[PDB]
Amino acid sequence: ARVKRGVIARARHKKILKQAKGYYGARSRVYRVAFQAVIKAGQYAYRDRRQRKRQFRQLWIARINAAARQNGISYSKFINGLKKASVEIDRKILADIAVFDKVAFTALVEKAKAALA
Amino acid sequence: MKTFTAKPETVKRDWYVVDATGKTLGRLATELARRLRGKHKAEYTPHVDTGDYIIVLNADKVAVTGNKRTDKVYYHHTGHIGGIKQATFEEMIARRPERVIEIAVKGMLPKGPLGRAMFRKLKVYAGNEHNHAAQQPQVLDI
Amino acid sequence: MRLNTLSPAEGSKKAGKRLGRGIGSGLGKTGGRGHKGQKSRSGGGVRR
Amino acid sequence: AKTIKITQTRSAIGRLPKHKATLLGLGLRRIGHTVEREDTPAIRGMINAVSFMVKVEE
Amino acid sequence: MYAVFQSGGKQHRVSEGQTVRLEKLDIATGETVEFAEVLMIANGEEVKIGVPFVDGGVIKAEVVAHGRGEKVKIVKFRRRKHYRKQQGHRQWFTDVKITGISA
RNA sequence: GUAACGGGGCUAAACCAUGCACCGAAGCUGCGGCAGCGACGCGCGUUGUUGGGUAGGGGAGCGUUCUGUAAGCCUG
Ligand SMILES: [Mg+2]
Ligand SMILES: [Mg+2]
Ligand SMILES: [Mg+2]
Ligand SMILES: [Mg+2]
Ligand SMILES: [Mg+2]
Ligand SMILES: [Mg+2]
Ligand SMILES: [Mg+2]
Ligand SMILES: [Mg+2]
Ligand SMILES: [Mg+2]
Ligand SMILES: [Mg+2]
Ligand SMILES: [Mg+2]
Ligand SMILES: [Mg+2]
Ligand SMILES: [Mg+2]
Ligand SMILES: [Mg+2]
Ligand SMILES: [Mg+2]
Ligand SMILES: [Mg+2]
Ligand SMILES: [Mg+2]
Ligand SMILES: [Mg+2]
Ligand SMILES: [Mg+2]
Ligand SMILES: [Mg+2]
Ligand SMILES: [Mg+2]
Ligand SMILES: [Mg+2]
Ligand SMILES: [Mg+2]
Ligand SMILES: [Mg+2]
Ligand SMILES: [Mg+2]
Ligand SMILES: [Mg+2]
Ligand SMILES: [Mg+2]
Ligand SMILES: [Mg+2]
Ligand SMILES: [Mg+2]
Ligand SMILES: [Mg+2]
Ligand SMILES: [Mg+2]
Ligand SMILES: [Mg+2]
Ligand SMILES: [Mg+2]
Ligand SMILES: [Mg+2]
Ligand SMILES: [Mg+2]
Ligand SMILES: [Mg+2]
Ligand SMILES: [Mg+2]
Ligand SMILES: [Mg+2]
Ligand SMILES: [Mg+2]
């Protein structure tokens, strides 16, 4: 019972070279270079599912800082006064109100300043 | 529902004029770079330019503290072997007073294609007059 | 009962060991032999 | 008998092997974990041994 | 008009007639769900901030579909150490439609 | 080639003492899902806990060629 490798070996190489579409030069044409490129792209993707959650909270805070100083208070004091008033709204929703409703955001700043009174 | 992102075809920028007479160099510089980048707006976007245009007047009346007026030194190399040069704070106010303000501001901005474009919005003059009355600049007390 | 309906008792036909067939199998590369000895060579070892 | 709250406030990585055995006899498993032990001179003896990384609410 | 409610460990702000994707809920595909807690309701210069909830506010929704999200791939590699491993994942969700909010 | 603050710059944006905030990790918590071990009761439920890994040991699988089932089944 002799086994020939041709049909199976071709299907396994065609699978890797399809995941390497759009890469530069030999990284999308040659199996040896493309297999290395596919493994690195999977390492980075695992790492960047963690950094995506850091990069967005950093953007939300910098926008709440800008909108609060237009009302006469800094970020670190604005957050402290909201916890003293038992407001549970998080950074993502706060950074959405600041851009789309300037009047509702102002009402929140006045709630915080009365807590620190 | 994704977060808002500013588009570079709908941004609104304003014009301001600031007087730099008797003001500390590095404390006036930090405020200018905050507004050239757009950090003072709730629409701030790290990959989009949302800053303002600023005109700086009286660039040769800026102030420093200590013995910095004669002790501070500026260095640069010309690219030829043994081509290290230097000048002091006295010497560059006498020669070209505008370079002092924008050397400080250029070091407080990001490095890259976008940081080079934020620098085009800064206009620095050595005297008390400018020629941008058509743009109608406003007064800013930094 | 047909010729395609008879099966062996459970536990009586454990499969063998195959060395050097990739990372996943657990016996790839060195094939359970370690690193660079007399006992890692072909036809290698000491007498009784 | 009288019982007390014990909580763990620091990590066990890099500690003496005799310290790790004191947290095993107390029952603590991770940071912020809380247990309910009885107040006897032998329990307080091994609270005193790892007090730098343990908080007690009586 | 819009309101903010909490569901599935996250928070959402919605308006009547929208469709929101949430974590999986154990409710049939035609039923009606209410969200009792409401963090804030804004109605055009009439803003109510809850401390922590708005007293008497309710949000009404309707379950539209259940499904699984796109497949992600997990790759684990360790150079020169003879190690590698891979996995796959699809995440469940539930879509609801906002029908009425009233305080 | 500045070149013994990472740089800009700083007379505090330096050091000392005291206080209250805030930022900050794949740590902890919240929500959804998967697997291992042990208990309690009838494969099932309730329940507690565990799941970084080289050398190496243990367990369960995918696919390829050939023989029977097959004078069967699919196919101009
Ligand atoms: Mg043959
Ligand atoms: Mg072949
Ligand atoms: Mg194949
Ligand atoms: Mg081929
Ligand atoms: Mg292959
Ligand atoms: Mg090529
Ligand atoms: Mg190509
Ligand atoms: Mg091609
Ligand atoms: Mg090849
Ligand atoms: Mg972060
Ligand atoms: Mg020369
Ligand atoms: Mg010389
Ligand atoms: Mg330069
Ligand atoms: Mg510079
Ligand atoms: Mg950088
Ligand atoms: Mg620049
Ligand atoms: Mg330029
Ligand atoms: Mg191994
Ligand atoms: Mg070898
Ligand atoms: Mg072996
Ligand atoms: Mg060895
Ligand atoms: Mg040797
Ligand atoms: Mg050996
Ligand atoms: Mg050999
Ligand atoms: Mg240590
Ligand atoms: Mg020299
Ligand atoms: Mg530093
Ligand atoms: Mg420099
Ligand atoms: Mg001081
Ligand atoms: Mg001070
Ligand atoms: Mg001080
Ligand atoms: Mg200090
Ligand atoms: Mg202190
Ligand atoms: Mg985190
Ligand atoms: Mg964890
Ligand atoms: Mg849960
Ligand atoms: Mg869970
Ligand atoms: Mg493992
Ligand atoms: Mg036949």
Side-chain angles (χ1 to χ4, degrees), chain E residues 14-19 31-35 58-64 96-102:
Chain E
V14 298
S15 66
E16 279 156 318
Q18 295 198 345
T19 293
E31 294 294 328
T32 295
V33 63
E34 318 165 352
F35 301 102
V58 180
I59 288 169
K60 299 291 180 68
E62 183 178 1
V63 191
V64 173
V96 310
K97 185 177 180 180
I98 314 292
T99 67
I101 62 170
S102 78

mmCIF file with all atom_site columns, all heavy atoms in Angstrom, chain E residues 14-19 31-35 58-64 96-102:
data_model
loop_
_atom_site.group_PDB
_atom_site.id
_atom_site.type_symbol
_atom_site.label_atom_id
_atom_site.label_alt_id
_atom_site.label_comp_id
_atom_site.label_asym_id
_atom_site.label_entity_id
_atom_site.label_seq_id
_atom_site.pdbx_PDB_ins_code
_atom_site.Cartn_x
_atom_site.Cartn_y
_atom_site.Cartn_z
_atom_site.occupancy
_atom_site.B_iso_or_equiv
_atom_site.pdbx_formal_charge
_atom_site.auth_seq_id
_atom_site.auth_comp_id
_atom_site.auth_asym_id
_atom_site.auth_atom_id
_atom_site.pdbx_PDB_model_num
ATOM 1   N N   . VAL E 1 14  ? -30.591 54.740 23.938 1.00 0.00 ? 14  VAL E N   1
ATOM 2   C CA  . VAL E 1 14  ? -31.452 54.333 22.835 1.00 0.00 ? 14  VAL E CA  1
ATOM 3   C C   . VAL E 1 14  ? -32.594 55.329 22.679 1.00 0.00 ? 14  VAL E C   1
ATOM 4   O O   . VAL E 1 14  ? -32.873 56.138 23.564 1.00 0.00 ? 14  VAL E O   1
ATOM 5   C CB  . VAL E 1 14  ? -32.018 52.912 23.038 1.00 0.00 ? 14  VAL E CB  1
ATOM 6   C CG1 . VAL E 1 14  ? -30.901 51.900 23.079 1.00 0.00 ? 14  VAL E CG1 1
ATOM 7   C CG2 . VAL E 1 14  ? -32.844 52.851 24.312 1.00 0.00 ? 14  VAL E CG2 1
ATOM 8   N N   . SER E 1 15  ? -33.265 55.244 21.533 1.00 0.00 ? 15  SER E N   1
ATOM 9   C CA  . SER E 1 15  ? -34.472 56.004 21.253 1.00 0.00 ? 15  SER E CA  1
ATOM 10  C C   . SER E 1 15  ? -35.498 55.073 20.626 1.00 0.00 ? 15  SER E C   1
ATOM 11  O O   . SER E 1 15  ? -35.157 54.017 20.094 1.00 0.00 ? 15  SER E O   1
ATOM 12  C CB  . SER E 1 15  ? -34.191 57.192 20.332 1.00 0.00 ? 15  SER E CB  1
ATOM 13  O OG  . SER E 1 15  ? -33.792 56.748 19.052 1.00 0.00 ? 15  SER E OG  1
ATOM 14  N N   . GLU E 1 16  ? -36.768 55.472 20.703 1.00 0.00 ? 16  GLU E N   1
ATOM 15  C CA  . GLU E 1 16  ? -37.856 54.606 20.261 1.00 0.00 ? 16  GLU E CA  1
ATOM 16  C C   . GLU E 1 16  ? -37.705 54.239 18.791 1.00 0.00 ? 16  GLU E C   1
ATOM 17  O O   . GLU E 1 16  ? -37.523 55.107 17.937 1.00 0.00 ? 16  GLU E O   1
ATOM 18  C CB  . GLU E 1 16  ? -39.201 55.293 20.486 1.00 0.00 ? 16  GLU E CB  1
ATOM 19  C CG  . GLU E 1 16  ? -39.725 55.207 21.900 1.00 0.00 ? 16  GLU E CG  1
ATOM 20  C CD  . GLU E 1 16  ? -40.691 56.329 22.228 1.00 0.00 ? 16  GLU E CD  1
ATOM 21  O OE1 . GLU E 1 16  ? -40.421 57.483 21.838 1.00 0.00 ? 16  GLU E OE1 1
ATOM 22  O OE2 . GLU E 1 16  ? -41.722 56.060 22.879 1.00 0.00 ? 16  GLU E OE2 1
ATOM 23  N N   . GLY E 1 17  ? -37.796 52.943 18.500 1.00 0.00 ? 17  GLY E N   1
ATOM 24  C CA  . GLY E 1 17  ? -37.711 52.445 17.146 1.00 0.00 ? 17  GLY E CA  1
ATOM 25  C C   . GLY E 1 17  ? -36.362 51.902 16.730 1.00 0.00 ? 17  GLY E C   1
ATOM 26  O O   . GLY E 1 17  ? -36.229 51.439 15.593 1.00 0.00 ? 17  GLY E O   1
ATOM 27  N N   . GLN E 1 18  ? -35.363 51.938 17.604 1.00 0.00 ? 18  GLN E N   1
ATOM 28  C CA  . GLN E 1 18  ? -34.037 51.436 17.282 1.00 0.00 ? 18  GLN E CA  1
ATOM 29  C C   . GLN E 1 18  ? -33.943 49.930 17.525 1.00 0.00 ? 18  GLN E C   1
ATOM 30  O O   . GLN E 1 18  ? -34.849 49.298 18.068 1.00 0.00 ? 18  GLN E O   1
ATOM 31  C CB  . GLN E 1 18  ? -32.976 52.162 18.102 1.00 0.00 ? 18  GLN E CB  1
ATOM 32  C CG  . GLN E 1 18  ? -32.859 53.634 17.799 1.00 0.00 ? 18  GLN E CG  1
ATOM 33  C CD  . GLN E 1 18  ? -31.557 54.216 18.291 1.00 0.00 ? 18  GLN E CD  1
ATOM 34  O OE1 . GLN E 1 18  ? -30.854 53.601 19.089 1.00 0.00 ? 18  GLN E OE1 1
ATOM 35  N NE2 . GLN E 1 18  ? -31.225 55.410 17.815 1.00 0.00 ? 18  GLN E NE2 1
ATOM 36  N N   . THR E 1 19  ? -32.814 49.361 17.111 1.00 0.00 ? 19  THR E N   1
ATOM 37  C CA  . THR E 1 19  ? -32.512 47.949 17.301 1.00 0.00 ? 19  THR E CA  1
ATOM 38  C C   . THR E 1 19  ? -31.143 47.832 17.952 1.00 0.00 ? 19  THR E C   1
ATOM 39  O O   . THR E 1 19  ? -30.165 48.392 17.449 1.00 0.00 ? 19  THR E O   1
ATOM 40  C CB  . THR E 1 19  ? -32.539 47.192 15.970 1.00 0.00 ? 19  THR E CB  1
ATOM 41  O OG1 . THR E 1 19  ? -33.876 47.173 15.460 1.00 0.00 ? 19  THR E OG1 1
ATOM 42  C CG2 . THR E 1 19  ? -32.059 45.767 16.155 1.00 0.00 ? 19  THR E CG2 1
ATOM 43  N N   . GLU E 1 31  ? -41.391 37.559 22.443 1.00 0.00 ? 31  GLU E N   1
ATOM 44  C CA  . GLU E 1 31  ? -41.922 38.026 23.711 1.00 0.00 ? 31  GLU E CA  1
ATOM 45  C C   . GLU E 1 31  ? -41.583 39.499 23.923 1.00 0.00 ? 31  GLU E C   1
ATOM 46  O O   . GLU E 1 31  ? -41.019 40.170 23.057 1.00 0.00 ? 31  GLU E O   1
ATOM 47  C CB  . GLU E 1 31  ? -41.385 37.164 24.848 1.00 0.00 ? 31  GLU E CB  1
ATOM 48  C CG  . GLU E 1 31  ? -41.865 35.728 24.796 1.00 0.00 ? 31  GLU E CG  1
ATOM 49  C CD  . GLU E 1 31  ? -43.350 35.599 25.026 1.00 0.00 ? 31  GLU E CD  1
ATOM 50  O OE1 . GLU E 1 31  ? -43.913 36.420 25.778 1.00 0.00 ? 31  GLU E OE1 1
ATOM 51  O OE2 . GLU E 1 31  ? -43.960 34.677 24.447 1.00 0.00 ? 31  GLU E OE2 1
ATOM 52  N N   . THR E 1 32  ? -41.936 40.011 25.100 1.00 0.00 ? 32  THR E N   1
ATOM 53  C CA  . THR E 1 32  ? -41.747 41.413 25.447 1.00 0.00 ? 32  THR E CA  1
ATOM 54  C C   . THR E 1 32  ? -40.982 41.501 26.757 1.00 0.00 ? 32  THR E C   1
ATOM 55  O O   . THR E 1 32  ? -41.337 40.831 27.731 1.00 0.00 ? 32  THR E O   1
ATOM 56  C CB  . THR E 1 32  ? -43.091 42.138 25.572 1.00 0.00 ? 32  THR E CB  1
ATOM 57  O OG1 . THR E 1 32  ? -43.736 42.173 24.293 1.00 0.00 ? 32  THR E OG1 1
ATOM 58  C CG2 . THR E 1 32  ? -42.894 43.559 26.073 1.00 0.00 ? 32  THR E CG2 1
ATOM 59  N N   . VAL E 1 33  ? -39.945 42.333 26.784 1.00 0.00 ? 33  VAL E N   1
ATOM 60  C CA  . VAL E 1 33  ? -39.090 42.496 27.951 1.00 0.00 ? 33  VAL E CA  1
ATOM 61  C C   . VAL E 1 33  ? -39.130 43.953 28.388 1.00 0.00 ? 33  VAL E C   1
ATOM 62  O O   . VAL E 1 33  ? -39.240 44.859 27.554 1.00 0.00 ? 33  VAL E O   1
ATOM 63  C CB  . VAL E 1 33  ? -37.645 42.037 27.658 1.00 0.00 ? 33  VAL E CB  1
ATOM 64  C CG1 . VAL E 1 33  ? -37.015 42.885 26.570 1.00 0.00 ? 33  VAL E CG1 1
ATOM 65  C CG2 . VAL E 1 33  ? -36.803 42.058 28.921 1.00 0.00 ? 33  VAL E CG2 1
ATOM 66  N N   . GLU E 1 34  ? -39.074 44.175 29.698 1.00 0.00 ? 34  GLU E N   1
ATOM 67  C CA  . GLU E 1 34  ? -39.005 45.509 30.273 1.00 0.00 ? 34  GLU E CA  1
ATOM 68  C C   . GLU E 1 34  ? -37.698 45.672 31.033 1.00 0.00 ? 34  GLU E C   1
ATOM 69  O O   . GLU E 1 34  ? -37.173 44.717 31.610 1.00 0.00 ? 34  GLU E O   1
ATOM 70  C CB  . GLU E 1 34  ? -40.179 45.780 31.214 1.00 0.00 ? 34  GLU E CB  1
ATOM 71  C CG  . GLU E 1 34  ? -41.514 45.281 30.707 1.00 0.00 ? 34  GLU E CG  1
ATOM 72  C CD  . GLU E 1 34  ? -42.570 45.248 31.797 1.00 0.00 ? 34  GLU E CD  1
ATOM 73  O OE1 . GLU E 1 34  ? -42.218 45.469 32.974 1.00 0.00 ? 34  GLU E OE1 1
ATOM 74  O OE2 . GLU E 1 34  ? -43.752 45.000 31.477 1.00 0.00 ? 34  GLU E OE2 1
ATOM 75  N N   . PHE E 1 35  ? -37.173 46.891 31.025 1.00 0.00 ? 35  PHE E N   1
ATOM 76  C CA  . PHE E 1 35  ? -35.956 47.235 31.754 1.00 0.00 ? 35  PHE E CA  1
ATOM 77  C C   . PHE E 1 35  ? -36.339 48.274 32.801 1.00 0.00 ? 35  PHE E C   1
ATOM 78  O O   . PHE E 1 35  ? -36.573 49.441 32.473 1.00 0.00 ? 35  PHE E O   1
ATOM 79  C CB  . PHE E 1 35  ? -34.877 47.740 30.804 1.00 0.00 ? 35  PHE E CB  1
ATOM 80  C CG  . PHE E 1 35  ? -34.498 46.744 29.746 1.00 0.00 ? 35  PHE E CG  1
ATOM 81  C CD1 . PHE E 1 35  ? -34.967 46.874 28.453 1.00 0.00 ? 35  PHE E CD1 1
ATOM 82  C CD2 . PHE E 1 35  ? -33.685 45.669 30.051 1.00 0.00 ? 35  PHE E CD2 1
ATOM 83  C CE1 . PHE E 1 35  ? -34.623 45.958 27.483 1.00 0.00 ? 35  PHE E CE1 1
ATOM 84  C CE2 . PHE E 1 35  ? -33.340 44.749 29.086 1.00 0.00 ? 35  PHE E CE2 1
ATOM 85  C CZ  . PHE E 1 35  ? -33.809 44.893 27.801 1.00 0.00 ? 35  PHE E CZ  1
ATOM 86  N N   . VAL E 1 58  ? -39.475 53.330 32.844 1.00 0.00 ? 58  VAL E N   1
ATOM 87  C CA  . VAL E 1 58  ? -39.492 51.975 32.306 1.00 0.00 ? 58  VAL E CA  1
ATOM 88  C C   . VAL E 1 58  ? -39.167 52.048 30.819 1.00 0.00 ? 58  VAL E C   1
ATOM 89  O O   . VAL E 1 58  ? -39.515 53.018 30.139 1.00 0.00 ? 58  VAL E O   1
ATOM 90  C CB  . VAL E 1 58  ? -40.859 51.283 32.537 1.00 0.00 ? 58  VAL E CB  1
ATOM 91  C CG1 . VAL E 1 58  ? -40.863 49.875 31.972 1.00 0.00 ? 58  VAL E CG1 1
ATOM 92  C CG2 . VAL E 1 58  ? -41.222 51.259 34.010 1.00 0.00 ? 58  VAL E CG2 1
ATOM 93  N N   . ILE E 1 59  ? -38.485 51.021 30.314 1.00 0.00 ? 59  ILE E N   1
ATOM 94  C CA  . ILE E 1 59  ? -38.177 50.887 28.893 1.00 0.00 ? 59  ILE E CA  1
ATOM 95  C C   . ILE E 1 59  ? -38.755 49.568 28.395 1.00 0.00 ? 59  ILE E C   1
ATOM 96  O O   . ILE E 1 59  ? -38.539 48.520 29.012 1.00 0.00 ? 59  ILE E O   1
ATOM 97  C CB  . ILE E 1 59  ? -36.663 50.955 28.625 1.00 0.00 ? 59  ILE E CB  1
ATOM 98  C CG1 . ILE E 1 59  ? -36.150 52.381 28.815 1.00 0.00 ? 59  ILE E CG1 1
ATOM 99  C CG2 . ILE E 1 59  ? -36.344 50.468 27.225 1.00 0.00 ? 59  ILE E CG2 1
ATOM 100 C CD1 . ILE E 1 59  ? -34.655 52.482 28.833 1.00 0.00 ? 59  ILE E CD1 1
ATOM 101 N N   . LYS E 1 60  ? -39.482 49.621 27.281 1.00 0.00 ? 60  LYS E N   1
ATOM 102 C CA  . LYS E 1 60  ? -40.157 48.463 26.707 1.00 0.00 ? 60  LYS E CA  1
ATOM 103 C C   . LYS E 1 60  ? -39.459 48.054 25.418 1.00 0.00 ? 60  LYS E C   1
ATOM 104 O O   . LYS E 1 60  ? -39.179 48.902 24.567 1.00 0.00 ? 60  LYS E O   1
ATOM 105 C CB  . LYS E 1 60  ? -41.623 48.781 26.416 1.00 0.00 ? 60  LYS E CB  1
ATOM 106 C CG  . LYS E 1 60  ? -42.440 49.154 27.628 1.00 0.00 ? 60  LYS E CG  1
ATOM 107 C CD  . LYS E 1 60  ? -42.642 47.985 28.559 1.00 0.00 ? 60  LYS E CD  1
ATOM 108 C CE  . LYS E 1 60  ? -43.461 48.404 29.764 1.00 0.00 ? 60  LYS E CE  1
ATOM 109 N NZ  . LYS E 1 60  ? -44.860 48.728 29.374 1.00 0.00 ? 60  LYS E NZ  1
ATOM 110 N N   . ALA E 1 61  ? -39.192 46.757 25.267 1.00 0.00 ? 61  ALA E N   1
ATOM 111 C CA  . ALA E 1 61  ? -38.528 46.248 24.074 1.00 0.00 ? 61  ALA E CA  1
ATOM 112 C C   . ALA E 1 61  ? -39.195 44.955 23.628 1.00 0.00 ? 61  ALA E C   1
ATOM 113 O O   . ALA E 1 61  ? -40.086 44.425 24.293 1.00 0.00 ? 61  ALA E O   1
ATOM 114 C CB  . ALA E 1 61  ? -37.031 46.028 24.313 1.00 0.00 ? 61  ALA E CB  1
ATOM 115 N N   . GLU E 1 62  ? -38.749 44.450 22.480 1.00 0.00 ? 62  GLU E N   1
ATOM 116 C CA  . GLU E 1 62  ? -39.268 43.220 21.895 1.00 0.00 ? 62  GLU E CA  1
ATOM 117 C C   . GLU E 1 62  ? -38.120 42.419 21.297 1.00 0.00 ? 62  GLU E C   1
ATOM 118 O O   . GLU E 1 62  ? -37.278 42.982 20.593 1.00 0.00 ? 62  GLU E O   1
ATOM 119 C CB  . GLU E 1 62  ? -40.309 43.520 20.815 1.00 0.00 ? 62  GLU E CB  1
ATOM 120 C CG  . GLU E 1 62  ? -40.946 42.287 20.218 1.00 0.00 ? 62  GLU E CG  1
ATOM 121 C CD  . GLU E 1 62  ? -42.002 42.622 19.191 1.00 0.00 ? 62  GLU E CD  1
ATOM 122 O OE1 . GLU E 1 62  ? -42.217 43.823 18.933 1.00 0.00 ? 62  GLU E OE1 1
ATOM 123 O OE2 . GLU E 1 62  ? -42.614 41.685 18.638 1.00 0.00 ? 62  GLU E OE2 1
ATOM 124 N N   . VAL E 1 63  ? -38.100 41.115 21.554 1.00 0.00 ? 63  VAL E N   1
ATOM 125 C CA  . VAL E 1 63  ? -37.004 40.262 21.107 1.00 0.00 ? 63  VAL E CA  1
ATOM 126 C C   . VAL E 1 63  ? -37.205 39.905 19.640 1.00 0.00 ? 63  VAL E C   1
ATOM 127 O O   . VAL E 1 63  ? -38.272 39.426 19.245 1.00 0.00 ? 63  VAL E O   1
ATOM 128 C CB  . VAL E 1 63  ? -36.906 39.002 21.977 1.00 0.00 ? 63  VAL E CB  1
ATOM 129 C CG1 . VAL E 1 63  ? -35.614 38.269 21.691 1.00 0.00 ? 63  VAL E CG1 1
ATOM 130 C CG2 . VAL E 1 63  ? -36.994 39.369 23.439 1.00 0.00 ? 63  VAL E CG2 1
ATOM 131 N N   . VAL E 1 64  ? -36.169 40.115 18.835 1.00 0.00 ? 64  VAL E N   1
ATOM 132 C CA  . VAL E 1 64  ? -36.244 39.971 17.387 1.00 0.00 ? 64  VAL E CA  1
ATOM 133 C C   . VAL E 1 64  ? -35.543 38.704 16.905 1.00 0.00 ? 64  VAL E C   1
ATOM 134 O O   . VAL E 1 64  ? -36.092 37.953 16.099 1.00 0.00 ? 64  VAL E O   1
ATOM 135 C CB  . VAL E 1 64  ? -35.673 41.222 16.680 1.00 0.00 ? 64  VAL E CB  1
ATOM 136 C CG1 . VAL E 1 64  ? -35.591 40.993 15.188 1.00 0.00 ? 64  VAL E CG1 1
ATOM 137 C CG2 . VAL E 1 64  ? -36.540 42.425 16.973 1.00 0.00 ? 64  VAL E CG2 1
ATOM 138 N N   . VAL E 1 96  ? -33.003 43.239 20.173 1.00 0.00 ? 96  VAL E N   1
ATOM 139 C CA  . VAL E 1 96  ? -34.295 43.720 20.633 1.00 0.00 ? 96  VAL E CA  1
ATOM 140 C C   . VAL E 1 96  ? -34.615 45.012 19.897 1.00 0.00 ? 96  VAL E C   1
ATOM 141 O O   . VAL E 1 96  ? -33.735 45.671 19.341 1.00 0.00 ? 96  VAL E O   1
ATOM 142 C CB  . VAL E 1 96  ? -34.335 43.947 22.159 1.00 0.00 ? 96  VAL E CB  1
ATOM 143 C CG1 . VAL E 1 96  ? -33.805 42.733 22.891 1.00 0.00 ? 96  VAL E CG1 1
ATOM 144 C CG2 . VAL E 1 96  ? -33.543 45.183 22.531 1.00 0.00 ? 96  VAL E CG2 1
ATOM 145 N N   . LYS E 1 97  ? -35.897 45.365 19.888 1.00 0.00 ? 97  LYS E N   1
ATOM 146 C CA  . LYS E 1 97  ? -36.374 46.588 19.257 1.00 0.00 ? 97  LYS E CA  1
ATOM 147 C C   . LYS E 1 97  ? -37.080 47.446 20.291 1.00 0.00 ? 97  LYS E C   1
ATOM 148 O O   . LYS E 1 97  ? -37.956 46.958 21.010 1.00 0.00 ? 97  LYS E O   1
ATOM 149 C CB  . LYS E 1 97  ? -37.322 46.285 18.098 1.00 0.00 ? 97  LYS E CB  1
ATOM 150 C CG  . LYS E 1 97  ? -37.760 47.523 17.340 1.00 0.00 ? 97  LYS E CG  1
ATOM 151 C CD  . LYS E 1 97  ? -38.629 47.175 16.154 1.00 0.00 ? 97  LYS E CD  1
ATOM 152 C CE  . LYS E 1 97  ? -39.060 48.425 15.416 1.00 0.00 ? 97  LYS E CE  1
ATOM 153 N NZ  . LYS E 1 97  ? -39.920 48.115 14.244 1.00 0.00 ? 97  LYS E NZ  1
ATOM 154 N N   . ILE E 1 98  ? -36.709 48.719 20.356 1.00 0.00 ? 98  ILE E N   1
ATOM 155 C CA  . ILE E 1 98  ? -37.300 49.636 21.322 1.00 0.00 ? 98  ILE E CA  1
ATOM 156 C C   . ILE E 1 98  ? -38.660 50.083 20.811 1.00 0.00 ? 98  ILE E C   1
ATOM 157 O O   . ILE E 1 98  ? -38.783 50.581 19.687 1.00 0.00 ? 98  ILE E O   1
ATOM 158 C CB  . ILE E 1 98  ? -36.376 50.836 21.570 1.00 0.00 ? 98  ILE E CB  1
ATOM 159 C CG1 . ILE E 1 98  ? -34.938 50.359 21.765 1.00 0.00 ? 98  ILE E CG1 1
ATOM 160 C CG2 . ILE E 1 98  ? -36.849 51.627 22.776 1.00 0.00 ? 98  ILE E CG2 1
ATOM 161 C CD1 . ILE E 1 98  ? -34.721 49.572 23.038 1.00 0.00 ? 98  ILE E CD1 1
ATOM 162 N N   . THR E 1 99  ? -39.686 49.909 21.636 1.00 0.00 ? 99  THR E N   1
ATOM 163 C CA  . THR E 1 99  ? -41.054 50.232 21.258 1.00 0.00 ? 99  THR E CA  1
ATOM 164 C C   . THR E 1 99  ? -41.632 51.406 22.029 1.00 0.00 ? 99  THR E C   1
ATOM 165 O O   . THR E 1 99  ? -42.400 52.187 21.464 1.00 0.00 ? 99  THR E O   1
ATOM 166 C CB  . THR E 1 99  ? -41.959 49.012 21.450 1.00 0.00 ? 99  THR E CB  1
ATOM 167 O OG1 . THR E 1 99  ? -42.058 48.703 22.844 1.00 0.00 ? 99  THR E OG1 1
ATOM 168 C CG2 . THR E 1 99  ? -41.391 47.814 20.711 1.00 0.00 ? 99  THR E CG2 1
ATOM 169 N N   . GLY E 1 100 ? -41.283 51.555 23.302 1.00 0.00 ? 100 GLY E N   1
ATOM 170 C CA  . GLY E 1 100 ? -41.760 52.679 24.079 1.00 0.00 ? 100 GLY E CA  1
ATOM 171 C C   . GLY E 1 100 ? -40.970 52.907 25.346 1.00 0.00 ? 100 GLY E C   1
ATOM 172 O O   . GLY E 1 100 ? -40.580 51.955 26.025 1.00 0.00 ? 100 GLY E O   1
ATOM 173 N N   . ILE E 1 101 ? -40.719 54.170 25.675 1.00 0.00 ? 101 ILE E N   1
ATOM 174 C CA  . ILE E 1 101 ? -40.075 54.551 26.924 1.00 0.00 ? 101 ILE E CA  1
ATOM 175 C C   . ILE E 1 101 ? -40.903 55.655 27.566 1.00 0.00 ? 101 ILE E C   1
ATOM 176 O O   . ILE E 1 101 ? -41.353 56.582 26.884 1.00 0.00 ? 101 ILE E O   1
ATOM 177 C CB  . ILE E 1 101 ? -38.610 54.988 26.706 1.00 0.00 ? 101 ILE E CB  1
ATOM 178 C CG1 . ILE E 1 101 ? -38.515 56.213 25.813 1.00 0.00 ? 101 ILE E CG1 1
ATOM 179 C CG2 . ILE E 1 101 ? -37.821 53.882 26.052 1.00 0.00 ? 101 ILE E CG2 1
ATOM 180 C CD1 . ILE E 1 101 ? -37.135 56.788 25.772 1.00 0.00 ? 101 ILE E CD1 1
ATOM 181 N N   . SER E 1 102 ? -41.134 55.541 28.872 1.00 0.00 ? 102 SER E N   1
ATOM 182 C CA  . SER E 1 102 ? -42.072 56.435 29.541 1.00 0.00 ? 102 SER E CA  1
ATOM 183 C C   . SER E 1 102 ? -41.754 56.512 31.025 1.00 0.00 ? 102 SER E C   1
ATOM 184 O O   . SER E 1 102 ? -41.580 55.481 31.680 1.00 0.00 ? 102 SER E O   1
ATOM 185 C CB  . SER E 1 102 ? -43.512 55.956 29.338 1.00 0.00 ? 102 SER E CB  1
ATOM 186 O OG  . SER E 1 102 ? -43.809 54.865 30.194 1.00 0.00 ? 102 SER E OG  1
#
